[PDB]
PDB file of C-alpha atoms in Angstrom:
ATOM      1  CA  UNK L 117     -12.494 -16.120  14.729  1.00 51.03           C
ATOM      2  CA  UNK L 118     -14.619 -18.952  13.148  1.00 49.24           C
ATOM      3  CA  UNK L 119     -13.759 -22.082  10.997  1.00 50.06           C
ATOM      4  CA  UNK L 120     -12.201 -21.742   7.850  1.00 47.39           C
ATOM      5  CA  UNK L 121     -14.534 -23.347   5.230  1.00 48.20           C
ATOM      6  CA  UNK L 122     -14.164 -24.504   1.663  1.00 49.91           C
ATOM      7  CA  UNK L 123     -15.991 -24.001  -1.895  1.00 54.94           C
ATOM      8  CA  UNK L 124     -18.557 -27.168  -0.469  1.00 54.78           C
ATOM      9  CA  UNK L 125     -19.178 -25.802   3.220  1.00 54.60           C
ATOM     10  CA  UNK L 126     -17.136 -27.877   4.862  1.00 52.19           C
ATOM     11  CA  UNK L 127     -14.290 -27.065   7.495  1.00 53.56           C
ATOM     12  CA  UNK L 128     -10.725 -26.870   6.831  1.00 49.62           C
ATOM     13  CA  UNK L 129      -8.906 -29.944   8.222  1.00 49.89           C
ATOM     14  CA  UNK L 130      -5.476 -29.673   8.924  1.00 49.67           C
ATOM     15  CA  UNK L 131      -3.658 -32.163   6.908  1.00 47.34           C
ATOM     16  CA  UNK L 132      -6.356 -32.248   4.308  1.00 49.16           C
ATOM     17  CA  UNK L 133      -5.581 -31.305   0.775  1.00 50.18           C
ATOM     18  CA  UNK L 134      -7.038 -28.163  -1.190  1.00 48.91           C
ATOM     19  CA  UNK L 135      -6.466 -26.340  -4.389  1.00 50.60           C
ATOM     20  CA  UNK L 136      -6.353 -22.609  -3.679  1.00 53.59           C
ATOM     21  CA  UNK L 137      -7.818 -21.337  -6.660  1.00 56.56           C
ATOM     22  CA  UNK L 138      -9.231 -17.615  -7.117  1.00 54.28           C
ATOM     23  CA  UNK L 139     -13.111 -16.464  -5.767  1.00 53.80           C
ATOM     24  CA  UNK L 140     -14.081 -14.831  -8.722  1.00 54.57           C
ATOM     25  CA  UNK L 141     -13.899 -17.233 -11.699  1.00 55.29           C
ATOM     26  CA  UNK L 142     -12.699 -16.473 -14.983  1.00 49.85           C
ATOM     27  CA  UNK L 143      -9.940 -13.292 -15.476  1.00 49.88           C
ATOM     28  CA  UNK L 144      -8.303 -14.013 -12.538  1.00 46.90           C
ATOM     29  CA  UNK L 145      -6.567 -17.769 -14.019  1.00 44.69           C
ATOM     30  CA  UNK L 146      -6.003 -20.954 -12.013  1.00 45.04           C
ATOM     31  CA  UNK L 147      -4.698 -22.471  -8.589  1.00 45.38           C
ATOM     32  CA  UNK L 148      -0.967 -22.167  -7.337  1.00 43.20           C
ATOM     33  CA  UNK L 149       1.903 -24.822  -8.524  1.00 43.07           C
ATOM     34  CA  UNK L 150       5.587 -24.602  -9.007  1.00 46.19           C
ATOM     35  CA  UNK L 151       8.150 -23.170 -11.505  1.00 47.44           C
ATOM     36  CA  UNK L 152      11.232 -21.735 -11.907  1.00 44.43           C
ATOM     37  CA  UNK L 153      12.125 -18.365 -11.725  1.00 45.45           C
ATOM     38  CA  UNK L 154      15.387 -16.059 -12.157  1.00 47.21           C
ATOM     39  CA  UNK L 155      17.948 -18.681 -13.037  1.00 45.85           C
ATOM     40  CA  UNK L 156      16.793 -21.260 -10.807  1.00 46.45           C
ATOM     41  CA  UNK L 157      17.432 -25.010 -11.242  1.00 49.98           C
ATOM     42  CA  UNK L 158      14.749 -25.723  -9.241  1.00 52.80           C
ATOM     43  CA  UNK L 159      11.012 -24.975  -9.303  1.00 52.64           C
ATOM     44  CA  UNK L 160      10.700 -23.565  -5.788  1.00 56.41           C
ATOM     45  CA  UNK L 161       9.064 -20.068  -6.383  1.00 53.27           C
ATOM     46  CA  UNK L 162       5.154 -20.343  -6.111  1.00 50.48           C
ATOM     47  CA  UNK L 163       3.083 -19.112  -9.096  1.00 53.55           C
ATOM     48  CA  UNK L 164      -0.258 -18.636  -9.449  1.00 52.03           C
ATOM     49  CA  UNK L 165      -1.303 -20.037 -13.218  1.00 55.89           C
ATOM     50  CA  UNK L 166      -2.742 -17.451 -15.779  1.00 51.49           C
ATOM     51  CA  UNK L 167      -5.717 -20.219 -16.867  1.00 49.97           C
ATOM     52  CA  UNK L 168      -9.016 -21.209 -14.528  1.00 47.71           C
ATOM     53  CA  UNK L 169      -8.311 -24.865 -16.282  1.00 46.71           C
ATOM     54  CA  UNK L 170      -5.012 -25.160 -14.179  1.00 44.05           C
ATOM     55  CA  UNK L 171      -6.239 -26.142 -10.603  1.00 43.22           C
ATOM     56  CA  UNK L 172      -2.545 -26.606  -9.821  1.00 45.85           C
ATOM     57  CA  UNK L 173      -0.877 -28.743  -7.170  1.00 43.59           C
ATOM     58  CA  UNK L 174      -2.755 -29.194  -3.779  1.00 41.41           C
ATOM     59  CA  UNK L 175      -1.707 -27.784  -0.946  1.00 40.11           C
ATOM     60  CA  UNK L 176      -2.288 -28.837   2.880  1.00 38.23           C
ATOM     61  CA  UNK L 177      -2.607 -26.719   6.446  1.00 35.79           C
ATOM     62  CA  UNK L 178      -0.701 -27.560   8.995  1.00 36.55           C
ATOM     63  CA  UNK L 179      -0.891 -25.873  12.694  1.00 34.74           C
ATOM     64  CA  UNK L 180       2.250 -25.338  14.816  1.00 32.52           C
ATOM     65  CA  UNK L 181       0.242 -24.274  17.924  1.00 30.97           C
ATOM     66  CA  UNK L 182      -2.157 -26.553  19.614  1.00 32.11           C
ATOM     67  CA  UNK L 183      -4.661 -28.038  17.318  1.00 29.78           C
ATOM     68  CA  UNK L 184      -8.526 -27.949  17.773  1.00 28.31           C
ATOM     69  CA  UNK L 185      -8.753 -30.446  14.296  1.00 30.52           C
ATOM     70  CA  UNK L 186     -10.016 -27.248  12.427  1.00 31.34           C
ATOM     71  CA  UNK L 187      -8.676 -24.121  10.928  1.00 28.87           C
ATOM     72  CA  UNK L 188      -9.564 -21.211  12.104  1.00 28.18           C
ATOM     73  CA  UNK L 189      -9.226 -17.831  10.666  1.00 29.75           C
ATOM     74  CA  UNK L 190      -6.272 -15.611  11.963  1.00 31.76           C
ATOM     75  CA  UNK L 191      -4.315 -18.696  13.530  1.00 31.15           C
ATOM     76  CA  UNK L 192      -0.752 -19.334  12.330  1.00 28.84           C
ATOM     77  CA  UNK L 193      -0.546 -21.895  10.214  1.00 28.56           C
ATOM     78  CA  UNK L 194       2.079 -23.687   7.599  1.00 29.13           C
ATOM     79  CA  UNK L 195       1.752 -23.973   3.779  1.00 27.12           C
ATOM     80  CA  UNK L 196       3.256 -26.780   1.867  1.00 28.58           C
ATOM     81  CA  UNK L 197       2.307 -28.299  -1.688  1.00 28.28           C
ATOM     82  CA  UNK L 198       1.527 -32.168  -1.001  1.00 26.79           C
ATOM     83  CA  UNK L 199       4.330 -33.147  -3.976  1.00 25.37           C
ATOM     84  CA  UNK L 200       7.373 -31.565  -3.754  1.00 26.21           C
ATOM     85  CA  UNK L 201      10.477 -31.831  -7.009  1.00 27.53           C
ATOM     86  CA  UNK L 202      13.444 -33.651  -5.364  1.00 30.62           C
ATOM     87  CA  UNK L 203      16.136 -30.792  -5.590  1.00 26.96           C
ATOM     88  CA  UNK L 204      13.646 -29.200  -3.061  1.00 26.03           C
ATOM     89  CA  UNK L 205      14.425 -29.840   0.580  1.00 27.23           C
ATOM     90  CA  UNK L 206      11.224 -29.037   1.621  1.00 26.90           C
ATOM     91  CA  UNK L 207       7.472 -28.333   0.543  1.00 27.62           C
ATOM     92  CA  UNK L 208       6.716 -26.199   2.976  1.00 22.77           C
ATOM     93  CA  UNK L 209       5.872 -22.423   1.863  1.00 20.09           C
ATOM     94  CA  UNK L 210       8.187 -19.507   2.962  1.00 21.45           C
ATOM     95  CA  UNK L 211       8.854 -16.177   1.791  1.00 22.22           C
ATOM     96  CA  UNK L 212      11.954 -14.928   0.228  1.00 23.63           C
ATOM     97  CA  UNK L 213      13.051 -11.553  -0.835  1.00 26.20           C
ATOM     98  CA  UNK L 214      13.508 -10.908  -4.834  1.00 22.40           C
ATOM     99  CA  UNK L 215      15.526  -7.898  -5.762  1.00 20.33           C
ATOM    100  CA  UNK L 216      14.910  -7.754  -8.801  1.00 21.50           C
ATOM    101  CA  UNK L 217      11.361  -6.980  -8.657  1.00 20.61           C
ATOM    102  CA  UNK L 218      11.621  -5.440  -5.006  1.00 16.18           C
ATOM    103  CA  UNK L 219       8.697  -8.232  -3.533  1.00 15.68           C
ATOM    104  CA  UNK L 220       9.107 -10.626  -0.816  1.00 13.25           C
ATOM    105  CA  UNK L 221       7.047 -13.509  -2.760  1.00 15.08           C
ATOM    106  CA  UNK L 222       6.173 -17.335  -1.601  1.00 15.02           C
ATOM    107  CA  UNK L 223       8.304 -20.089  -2.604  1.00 16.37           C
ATOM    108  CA  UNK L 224       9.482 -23.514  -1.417  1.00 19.56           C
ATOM    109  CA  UNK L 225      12.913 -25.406  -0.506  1.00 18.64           C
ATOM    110  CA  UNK L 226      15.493 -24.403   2.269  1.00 17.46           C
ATOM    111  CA  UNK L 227      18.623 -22.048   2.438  1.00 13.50           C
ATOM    112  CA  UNK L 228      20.587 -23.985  -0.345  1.00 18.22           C
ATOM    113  CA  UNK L 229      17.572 -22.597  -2.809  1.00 19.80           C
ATOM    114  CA  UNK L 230      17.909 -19.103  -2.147  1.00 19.31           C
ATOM    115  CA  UNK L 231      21.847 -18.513  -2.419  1.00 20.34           C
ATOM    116  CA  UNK L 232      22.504 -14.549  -2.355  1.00 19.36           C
ATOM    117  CA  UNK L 233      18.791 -13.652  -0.849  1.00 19.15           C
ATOM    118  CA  UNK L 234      16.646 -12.973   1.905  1.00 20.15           C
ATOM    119  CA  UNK L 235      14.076 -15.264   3.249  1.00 21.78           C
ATOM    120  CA  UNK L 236      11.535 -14.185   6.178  1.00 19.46           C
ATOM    121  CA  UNK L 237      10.834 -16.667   9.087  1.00 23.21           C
ATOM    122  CA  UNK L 238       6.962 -16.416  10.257  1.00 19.39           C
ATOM    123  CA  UNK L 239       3.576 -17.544  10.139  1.00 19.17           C
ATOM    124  CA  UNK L 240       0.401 -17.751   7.605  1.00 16.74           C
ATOM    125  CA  UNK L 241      -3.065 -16.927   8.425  1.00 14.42           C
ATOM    126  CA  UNK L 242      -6.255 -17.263   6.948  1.00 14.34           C
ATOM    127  CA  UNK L 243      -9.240 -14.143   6.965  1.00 15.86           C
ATOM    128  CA  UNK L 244     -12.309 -13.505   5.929  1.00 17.99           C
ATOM    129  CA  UNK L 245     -11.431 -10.722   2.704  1.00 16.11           C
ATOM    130  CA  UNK L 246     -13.949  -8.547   4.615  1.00 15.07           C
ATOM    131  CA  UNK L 247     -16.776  -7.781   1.561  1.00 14.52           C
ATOM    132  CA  UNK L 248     -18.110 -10.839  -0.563  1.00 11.06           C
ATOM    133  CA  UNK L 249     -17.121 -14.183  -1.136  1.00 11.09           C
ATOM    134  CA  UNK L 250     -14.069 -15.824   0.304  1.00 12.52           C
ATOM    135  CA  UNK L 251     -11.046 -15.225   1.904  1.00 10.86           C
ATOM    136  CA  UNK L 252      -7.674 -14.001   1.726  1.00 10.48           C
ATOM    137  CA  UNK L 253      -4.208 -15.458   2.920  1.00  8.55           C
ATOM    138  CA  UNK L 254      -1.619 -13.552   5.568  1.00  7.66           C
ATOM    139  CA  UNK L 255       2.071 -13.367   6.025  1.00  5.15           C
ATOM    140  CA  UNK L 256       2.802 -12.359   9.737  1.00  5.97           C
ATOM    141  CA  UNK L 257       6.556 -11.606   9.953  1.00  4.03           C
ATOM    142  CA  UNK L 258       8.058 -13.955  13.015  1.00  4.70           C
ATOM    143  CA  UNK L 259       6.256 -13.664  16.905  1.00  2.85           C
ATOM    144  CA  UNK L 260       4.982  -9.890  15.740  1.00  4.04           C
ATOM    145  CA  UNK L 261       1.594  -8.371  14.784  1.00  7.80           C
ATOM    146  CA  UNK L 262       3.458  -6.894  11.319  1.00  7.92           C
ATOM    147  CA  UNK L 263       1.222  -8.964   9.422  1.00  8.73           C
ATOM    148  CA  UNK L 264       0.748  -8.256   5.176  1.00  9.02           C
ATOM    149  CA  UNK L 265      -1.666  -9.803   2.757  1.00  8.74           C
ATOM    150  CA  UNK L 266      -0.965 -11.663   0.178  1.00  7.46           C
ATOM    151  CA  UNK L 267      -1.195 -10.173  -2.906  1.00  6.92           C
ATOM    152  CA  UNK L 268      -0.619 -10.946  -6.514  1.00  7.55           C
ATOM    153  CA  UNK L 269       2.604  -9.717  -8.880  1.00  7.51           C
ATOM    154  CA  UNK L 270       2.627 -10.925 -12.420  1.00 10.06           C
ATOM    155  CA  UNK L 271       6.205 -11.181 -13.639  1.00 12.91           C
ATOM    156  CA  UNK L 272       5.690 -12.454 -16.868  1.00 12.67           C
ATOM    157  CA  UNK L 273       6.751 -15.988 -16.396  1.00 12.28           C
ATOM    158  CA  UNK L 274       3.528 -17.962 -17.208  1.00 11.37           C
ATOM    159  CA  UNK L 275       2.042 -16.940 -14.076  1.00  8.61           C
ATOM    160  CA  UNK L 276       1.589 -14.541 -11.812  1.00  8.45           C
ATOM    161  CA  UNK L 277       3.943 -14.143  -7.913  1.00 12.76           C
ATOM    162  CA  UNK L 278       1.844 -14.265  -4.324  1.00  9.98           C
ATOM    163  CA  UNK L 279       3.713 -11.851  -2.644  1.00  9.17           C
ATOM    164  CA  UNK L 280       3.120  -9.515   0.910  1.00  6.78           C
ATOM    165  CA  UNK L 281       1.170  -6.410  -0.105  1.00  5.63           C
ATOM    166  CA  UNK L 282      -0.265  -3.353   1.293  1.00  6.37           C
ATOM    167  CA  UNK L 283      -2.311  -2.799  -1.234  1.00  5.01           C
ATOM    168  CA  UNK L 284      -5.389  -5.381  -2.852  1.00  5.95           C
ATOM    169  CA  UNK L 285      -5.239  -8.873  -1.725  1.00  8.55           C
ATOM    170  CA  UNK L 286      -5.622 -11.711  -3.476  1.00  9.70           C
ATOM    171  CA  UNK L 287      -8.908 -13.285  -2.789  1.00 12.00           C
ATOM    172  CA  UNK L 288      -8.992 -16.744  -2.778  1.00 10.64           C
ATOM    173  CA  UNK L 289     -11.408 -20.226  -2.010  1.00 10.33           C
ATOM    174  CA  UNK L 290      -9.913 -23.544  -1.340  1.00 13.38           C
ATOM    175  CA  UNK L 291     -11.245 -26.751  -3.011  1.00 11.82           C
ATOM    176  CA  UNK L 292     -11.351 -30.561  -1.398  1.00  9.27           C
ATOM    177  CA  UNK L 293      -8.478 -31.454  -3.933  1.00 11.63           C
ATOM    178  CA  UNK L 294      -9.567 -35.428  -4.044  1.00  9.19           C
TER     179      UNK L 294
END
């Protein structure tokens, strides 16, 4: 349990805005934006872009709990991009359930987005990836320790899916986006 720092040192402020762009530069791609995805009208599904040039749109950390002013690692925390496309209720990350691909993977909106599917209630989290550089981000499935990883699932749809995984995690750093 300690603060959660970015790329320059500096703590994590709730509210603040960050790109979330990969640890190791250069195979890996760019930071996490919106697109469309299986028939979709709407760009709600989260994709992480194929090219390091692509920062992507800035996200910001929001606690539900009570707040110290700081993130720490392994506290629940909210997701959501700082723009948001209008046929999206909300910005605020959550995870749905794609069949097609058999992945519950991070997207945005509300209900009216995610017609004939699945979407998971719960929390993120923040941790230390354990070896190395930076960090990874956590899905913890609503008021229970069944907690996943998120991990990476390339699709083919000019980028890649965050998605819960029990397997390799995707390890990330988080940039003052300003």
């Amino acid at each position: 349990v300690e603060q959660v720092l970015d790329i320059n040192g500096n703590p994590i402020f709730p509210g603040g805005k960050y790109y979330i762009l990969p640890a190791i530069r250069g195979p890996p791609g760019g930071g996490v934006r919106l697109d469309k995805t299986g028939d979709s009208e709407c760009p709600v599904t989260v994709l992480q872009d194929y090219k390091e040039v692509i920062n992507g749109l800035p996200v910001k950390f929001v606690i539900p709990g009570i707040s110290p002013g700081i993130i720490f690692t392994g506290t629940p925390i909210e997701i959501e991009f700082t723009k948001k496309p209008n046929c999206a209720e909300s910005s605020k990350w959550l995870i749905f359930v794609d069949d097609t691909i058999d992945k519950a993977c991070i997207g945005i909106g509300g209900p009216e987005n995610y017609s004939g599917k699945q979407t998971l209630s719960g929390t993120f989290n923040i941790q230390k990836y354990g070896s190395g550089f930076g960090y990874k981000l956590g899905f913890c499935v609503k008021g229970s320790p069944i907690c996943l990883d998120i991990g990476r699932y390339d699709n083919d749809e000019g980028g890649r899916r965050l998605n819960l995984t029990e397997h390799e995690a995707f390890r990330v750093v988080f940039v003052d986006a300003s």
